[PDB]
């Protein structure tokens, strides 16, 4: 397309746009829980309510989401750093390292580390380089009070002010 | 609707940085808007996305010229965020800005970083368009990011 910025320049830029932190979960086609830490969550539209997440091609989580067409977005509170670490690290059995429950849909809900969970139906996808944007039409939301966890400038932080 | 309100309440609790996304329209006029939907998409090549309302002046400009700038606001930039989200006309007369060599508007006083992007694709979703921006050039300085979350502005705390 033309000149591209060096990957380190891009990483430095995007490190300076802080975000909340989710764990995006699903079941694979055999019913096994899958999930990953995800900071690339944003709102797409209100009609109907649709968010998006951007997941690596070949990841276990995207494989499950693509096959089953459902996923949950678990928004982490300020007590959820360890869950974010578990779900981005090398442990082979991540759901043994967090407290979690299964909703009627089967989707994993990190009910001790997340202050909100949105259950979503996949309504579309768009491949982009090594990743895929997944559009999720929100079907159900459970939300409680909590201070959001943040990630920015290569560090965890908490949203700094009370509700 | 009630479903829409529940969704707004959810997404309000996902805080973010704040950008002003700028472009030139097909007639050369600067356009832009406040944007919190900046999202990293991939590194091959480095590509971010934004979600812009269909029919917005900024989306029309981005679509016409196939380029845009993402100006990341520092914690002194609330006023620019308000100008670029509010109803009052003549936004560019209400901020100090300069033109990059490419022509794209750079909010030099309110932003700590500016990324110049080429539009590599667009996908409509409901009444919005997801715009994929392949990043071509970045100017970045130290700065403390402005944040927006829980229906308020704040500053990155570290
Ligand atoms: C703050 C933050 C934000 C992130 N945001 C995103 C995002 O938006 N999108 C995205 O795609 N990624 C993101 N990641 C990276 C993502 O969390 C990890 O790549 C995660 O490992 C993907 O898990 P998976 O099970 O889907 O994938 P896989 O890579 O398929 O991992 C399969 C399983 O292998 C194990 N495993 C994982 N990594 C290793 C390893 N290095 N060595 C050995 N075993 C391993 C785990 O049990 C994992 O469940 C983020 C990470 C962080 C820290
Ligand atoms: C959208 C996304 C995709 C990811 N894909 C992978 C992956 O394929 N394999 C893997 O092992 N880990 C992946 N990760 C995890 C990533 O490599 C970092 O470990 C994590 O983002 C935390 O990085 P850091 O901010 O502390 O610093 P850095 O690694 O310097 O990253 C700075 C910022 O750059 C962006 N970024 C970094 N890596 C990627 C990437 N691969 N794609 C898109 N944006 C990126 C993020 O916004 C991140 O916060 C991904 C993260 C994100 C947000
Ligand atoms: C924190 C935050 C984040 C946001 N994030 C996003 C995002 O990611 N995506 C998105 O699409 N929107 C977002 N918005 C909303 C967006 O900034 C505004 O809708 C903005 O007005 C769009 O500008 P435009 O010039 O492209 O639109 P237009 O509606 O085409 O407005 C044209 C011009 O008319 C004036 N004007 C604007 N609104 C009105 C009005 N209601 N009545 C009369 N004149 C008006 C302004 O001068 C504007 O430049 C966000 C707002 C906030 C506060
Ligand atoms: C991606 C995005 C798109 C937007 N599109 C428009 C638009 O088309 N017209 C307009 O006048 N203003 C739009 N806005 C501005 C928006 O309506 C709010 O005025 C602004 O986000 C500040 O709201 P708030 O967070 O304080 O509270 P709320 O209005 O409660 O919004 C909470 C969150 O809900 C989501 N959201 C709100 N409105 C929209 C929307 N219309 N489309 C998608 N997600 C939304 C965002 O994630 C926002 O942060 C948009 C904002 C964003 C982030």
TrEMBL record, chain B:
One of its GO terms (molecular function) is FMN binding. Keywords: FAD, Flavoprotein, Nucleotide-binding, Oxidoreductase. NADH binds at residues 8, 128, 148, 151. The keyword Disulfide bond does not apply. The keyword Calcium does not apply. FAD 3 binds at residues 34-37, 51, 53, 57-58, 87-88, 91. Residues 11-155 form the Flavin reductase like domain. FAD 1 binds at residues 8, 128, 148, 151. FAD 2 binds at residues 8, 128, 148, 151. This is Flavin reductase. The chain holds residues 9 to 166 of 193 of the full protein.
């Amino acid at each position: 397309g033309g000149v591209t910025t060096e990957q380190q320049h891009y990483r430095d830029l995007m490190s300076a746009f802080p975000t909340g932190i989710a764990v995006v979960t699903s079941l694979d086609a055999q019913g096994v829980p899958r999930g990953m830490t995800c900071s690339s969550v944003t709102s797409a539209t209100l009609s109907p309510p649709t968010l998006l997440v951007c997941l690596r091609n070949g990841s276990a989580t995207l494989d499950a989401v693509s096959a089953t067409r459902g996923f949950a977005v678990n928004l982490l509170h300020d007590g959820g750093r360890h869950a974010a670490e578990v779900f981005s690290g090398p442990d082979p059995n991540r759901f043994s390292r967090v407290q979690w429950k299964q909703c009627r849909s089967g989707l994993p809900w990190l009910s001790k580390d997340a202050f909100a969970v949105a259950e979503c139906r996949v309504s579309g996808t768009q491949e982009v380089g090594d990743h895929t944007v997944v559009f999720g039409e929100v079907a159900r939301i459970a939300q409680t009070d909590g201070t959001p966890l943040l990630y920015g400038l290569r560090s965890f932080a908490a949203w700094p002010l009370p509700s």
